[PDB]
Amino acid sequence: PLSPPTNLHLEANPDTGVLTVSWERSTTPDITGYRITTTPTNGQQGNSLEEVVHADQSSCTFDNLSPGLEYNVSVYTVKDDKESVPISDTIIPEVPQLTDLSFVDITDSSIGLRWTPLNSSTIIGYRITVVAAGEGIPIFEDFVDSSVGYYTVTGLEPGIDYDISVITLINGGESAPTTLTQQTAVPPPTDLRFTNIGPDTMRVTWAPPPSIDLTNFLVRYSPVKNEEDVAELSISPSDNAVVLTNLLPGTEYVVSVSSVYEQHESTPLRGRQKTGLDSPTGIDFSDITANSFTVHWIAPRATITGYRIRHHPEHFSGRPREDRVPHSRNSITLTNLTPGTEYVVSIVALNGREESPLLIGQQSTVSA
Amino acid sequence: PLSPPTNLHLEANPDTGVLTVSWERSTTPDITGYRITTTPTNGQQGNSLEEVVHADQSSCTFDNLSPGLEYNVSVYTVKDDKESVPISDTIIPEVPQLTDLSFVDITDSSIGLRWTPLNSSTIIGYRITVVAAGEGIPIFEDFVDSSVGYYTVTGLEPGIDYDISVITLINGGESAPTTLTQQTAVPPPTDLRFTNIGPDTMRVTWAPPPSIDLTNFLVRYSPVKNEEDVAELSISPSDNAVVLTNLLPGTEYVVSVSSVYEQHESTPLRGRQKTGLDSPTGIDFSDITANSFTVHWIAPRATITGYRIRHHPEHFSGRPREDRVPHSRNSITLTNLTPGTEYVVSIVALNGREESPLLIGQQSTVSA
Structure with missing residues (x-):
């Protein structure tokens, strides 16, 4: 009677797909080797594997088991013509x-x-x-x-x-x-549009996400050259536009709209928009004569390249005379005027083709 | 008493901003010329214009009237030191x-x-x-x-x-x-996605426009190489996905989704999607021996580059043997098999890295 192996250990490595079978060697002196079978448990009748090792070996590997199937593994001590009763165990590779x-x-x-x-x-x-x-x-x-x-x-x-x-x-x-x-x-708003652009004001519009039990909208704005100073408004759930007021003329602003829900906030819908030029102010006149006078004004705050000055007799606006004045100047003398005539004078600030709203005033020449 | 002009006519051209004044000449023999005034009607006291023409002239132009203001135009016959009573009319330039x-x-x-x-x-x-x-x-x-x-x-x-x-x-x-x-x-649907791609089937998904009293969705589809044959489905207002069935394998389809409202239809949201490869069919075996057999199959309908054939003993799927067969072939002989062993054979169609689902079958070698 040959002593079977002892302490059968089955290890099925899921990373490698390899089953390691190990055992403690038999206590019988002169053995040929070991015989190891692997068989699916449903029935021995089908396919099975057999591995044969030498007497000094106490492990072997099977690299082709099916993940998910249960297998019986049996190890037999072999002495030439004879075999021990086996040691058996089952394993299910993950x-x-x-x-x-x-x-x-x-x-x-x-x-x-x-x-x-x-x-x-x-x-x-x-x-x-x-x-x-x-x-x-x-x-x-x-x-x-x-x-x-x-x-x-x-x-x-x-x-x-x-x-x-x-x-x-x-x-x-x-x-x-x-x-x-x-x-x-x-979900963030989409499609940021800026309308109604003034020197001190702009209208901001967005498309809200689908139809949601929305709490409110968050609107943040700041000059590009001064990201620090951020203002913030709370916008009604059903509104999709806010008119920003009190802004600086000729200044590029960064604007961002965020949707609010369950205390969380959406990603900002962000774009940049410049405000328009502010008008010159404080039109004045001096040194009135029959055929001329001098016009004065005060520079707007925004950066400009120059001004456009137009004049024509009051009630005859059809074909005005025109002058261009660089930004370094804030007066002009208008000549070749008609005596005893009320004149309308208009001043516009220019930055290239950007135009401010009109500054308008009236002055009369004296009689000849 | 000098005879005034007759038939005063005032024409204010809005395109040019020019007022043409015309008249019939006086019936008095020896006249110096005509005098024409233009004055805003509110009061004569302010600015007015005066034009003087020679005796042979019966028209003059004023190019600087204000659009929108009412003006009195008067024409006077002039005889040296004297003048006729005027002929007058008003006009409001558009x-x-x-x-x-x-x-x-x-x-x-x-x-x-x-x-x-x-x-x-x-x-x-x-x-x-x-x-x-x-x-x-x-x-x-x-x-x-x-x-x-x-x-x-x-x-x-x-x-x-x-x-x-x-x-x-x-x-x-x-x-x-x-x-x-x-x-x-x-408003059209947006963001066309294709999921669940089979050889004969695909799932089409879209994002519907906002929240609208929608009547239904219109889904049209056709092969790229055969634009003629268009199928059409009516999709429920609340659904945003349809599973297309009965399609041809390995075929690029054009799909378009249209929203329906007030009998009108939206613009089509359009994209293109190919169906997957169909499997080989009709696996069969022949000429069974102890260590080999021949495997047969039938080509799928889709265009393929070749097949991948895998085999392993039943219940030992871990480490299968592999062969590649070009599309010009529909059989292979598998050798170096084990006697009395049930084998699992799987065939996959390939188009480059595109793979079909498996065709699977089983054959046993005979005993030695």
Whole structure:
């Protein structure tokens, strides 16, 4: 009676797909070797594997087991013509499962999936399950190749938690699911337009996201050359425009609109808009004669290149005379005027082709 | 007593800004000439113009009247030291008004404005009025320079008629408004995604426009190489996805989704998607021996570059043997097999890295 092996140990490595079988050697003196069988437990009748090792060996490997199947492993002491009663145990090799599922590109309707594929030749694909933990059903299942580690989930609501699982697929089997939970972001406004541009004012407009139980909108603004100074307004849920007041003339402003929901805020919709030129002020006249007078004004605050001065007799605006004056000047003498005539004089600030609103005043020449 | 002129005629050309004054000459024999005054009617006290012509002349021009002001024009026969009683009439020069307002770029929220500026130096700008003829107020007024003929109106609803006017602005005055009426377009779906791609099937998804009393969605599809054959489905207002069935494998399809409202249809949201490869079919075996057998299959319909054949003993899927076969072949002999062993054989069609689903079958070698 040959003493069987003892302390059978079965280790099925899911990373390598290799089963290591190890044992404690028999206590019988002169043995030929060991015989190791691997057989699926349903019935011995089908395919089985056999490995034979020398007497000094106390381990062997089987590299081709099916993940998910149960196997009986038996080890026999061999003495030439004879064999011990075996030592047996069962093992079920794990179906490999992704351990590095990650979320990236989280928008208000989109979630990107980030995992690293498994280079095992038993793997026919991966199932992606998306369950809305809110009130939706398991709405979304999709399938993918063995050679993908990059999937994108789209068409999601902003106010919902999603359960996202990836299941490793083999032939007639699955891994346990790897699941993660995430809310999508608060949806930002879109399409930022600036209208009604004055020297001190501008109207800001945006397209709100779909139809949401929105709390309010957040509007932030600041000069480009002075990012520090930020003002902030709370805008009504149903409004999509605010008229900004009290702004500096000829100044580029940075504006951003954020949607508010569940205390969170959306990403800023951002653009830049310059205010217009302010008008010259303080028109005045001096040294009136029958055929001439001198016109004065005060520079606007904004940076200008010069002015356009127009004049014509009051009530005859049809064909005015015109002069251009650089920004370094704030007066002009108008000549070749008609005696005893009321004149209308208008001054416009220019920055290239940018124009300020008119400064208008009236002065009469004296009688000849 | 000198006979005054007769049949006074006043013509104020709005295109040129010039007033032509004409008359029938006096019936008095020896006259010096004519004297023509132009005066604003409010009171003669302010500025007025005077033109003097020779005896043979029966017309004169004034090029500097103000559009919108009423003027008295008087013509006097002159005989050296003396003058006739005048012939008088009043005229109000029209404030020029745009006659070529046009609509272009009509989307579902946007209307572009197309007019040609007026090169008159009395014109300080143009007002744009946008009244929703639906239920909205005169929500939108904006202002613009004399040198613009290109404005864009944005942020509009799909189910509304808009009244859009442009008013010519002068100093202390306006033209009559030039008005046009338009509905905006039916809003299209956005963001076309294709999921669940099979050989015969694909899932089409879109983002619907805002929140609208939508009637239904229109889905059209056709192969790229056969644009003629178009199928069409009616999709529920609340659904944003349809699973297309019965498609041809390995074939690029053109798909387009249209929103339906008030019998009109939106612009198509269009993209292209290829279906996957279909599997080989009809696996079979022949000429079985102890260490080999021949495998057969039938080509899939789609265009392929070749096949991948894998085999392994049943219940030992861990480390299968592999062969590549070009598309010109539909059989392979597998050798160096084990006797009395059930084998699992799988065939996959390949087009480069594109893979079909598996065709799987089983064959046993005979006993040695």
